[PDB]
Amino acid sequence: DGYKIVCYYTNWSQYRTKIGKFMPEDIQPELCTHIIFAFGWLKKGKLSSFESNDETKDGKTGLYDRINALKKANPKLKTLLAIGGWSFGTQKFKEMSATRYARQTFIYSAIPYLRDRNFDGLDIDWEYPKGGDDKKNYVLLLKELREAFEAEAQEVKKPRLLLTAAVPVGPDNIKSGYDVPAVASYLDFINLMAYDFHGKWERETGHNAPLYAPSSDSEWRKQLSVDHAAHLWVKLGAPKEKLIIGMPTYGRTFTLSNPNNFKVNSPASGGGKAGEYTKESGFLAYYEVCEILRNGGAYVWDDEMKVPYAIHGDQWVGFDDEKSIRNKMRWIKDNSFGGAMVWTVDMDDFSGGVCGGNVKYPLIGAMREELRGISRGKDAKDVDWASVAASV
């Protein structure tokens, strides 16, 4: 009952160093209504593990069990296993959904794989189906998965395995690969990837997840906003309550061609310089942005896009803070959507000692607070960056 807080946990986050080191036990059992494990993998057309670390062997407990152990403290919590993602690619999905034999093989591999490891569902993260064949076969996959789950649930007398999917916000991707009515019908809920609207693949600075598009955007670009994307999914046949709106605990970075031209849609030479912990050009975790803001960085609130960006020299980072997150929760409630999804749970200020507010999971905590009325704590106040950081 109520709004969902669907949190993505990424296994590779186990490899991060110092402030960036994250383990399943760092997740508060009551933080999320759902936890999605990213990722599973595909082996010989069957559901399998990314690597042996996820699995439990020889007394050594794997990441699967450590994630699912949170349900012992919070029996209300739901966990799902995600298959797909950026690394996974498209070809394996094309092969899996091309024929009924391959689909059925995957499905009947997937059911016991999930049951034996105490997962409550499956999350499909195909990035992305493209073309008529993919469009039709994706629907067939979701359909047959759903019917198999429905049947299994009644046969074994257990709560039905959930079927969800992570879907894009780009109009062309949506049009090319997604038969929205059927897709929405066959899924329990829909994880809208409301981020990566803009990034280093673009010549000018743009926000990672603008609620509304800036007036400087061309007519085509203006489609690239959370509001437009969500309402687009509704327009195409997706029920509002099934749309779980994505929220990034990360920001997209650029290097300015000129440090004096630092507004949105300003010329950039490329991606921003890589962070210490995520180690990827054009990308920053939220706590890295916090580090920037507490060490000379300038804070700018864009009131058109309802989102902040930070500037340090020629480094420009479009990100989400407690303010923009809360505003987005209000937007969610105003539009009657199903809740908030999070990418990720391991890039929030999970330790509570980086951003300054001394609050563990300030962003996701804010989401849970606005949507579900659970306080983050007695003296838990948002960081007012406009006062804390420098101005332009």
Numbering used by the authors: 91 to 482
Authors' description from the paper:
GH18A crystallized in space group P41212, and the structure was determined by molecular replacement using human AMCase as a template. The structures of the complexes were determined by molecular replacement using GH18A as a template. These structures were resolved to resolutions of between 2.0 and 3.0 Å and all data-collection and structure-refinement statistics are summarized in Table 2. A unique loop (residues 145–152) is adjacent to the α7 helix. Additionally, a substrate-binding groove with lined-up aromatic residues is located on the surface. Secondly, the structures of GH18A and GH18B are very similar, with an r.m.s.d. of 0.88 Å for 344 Cα atoms. Although the overall structures of GH18A and GH18B are similar to that of OfChtI-CAD, with r.m.s.d.s of 1.3 Å (for 367 Cα atoms) and 1.5 Å (for 360 Cα atoms), respectively, there are obvious differences between the two enzymes. Firstly, GH18A and GH18B from OfChtIII do not have the same surface hydrophobic planes as found in the GH18 domain of OfChtI (characterized by Phe159, Phe194, Trp241 and Tyr290). Secondly, both GH18 domains have shorter and shallower substrate-binding clefts than OfChtI-CAD. As calculated by the CASTp software with default parameters, the volumes of the substrate-binding clefts of OfChtI-CAD, GH18A and GH18B were estimated to be 1628, 1399 and 1100 Å3, respectively.
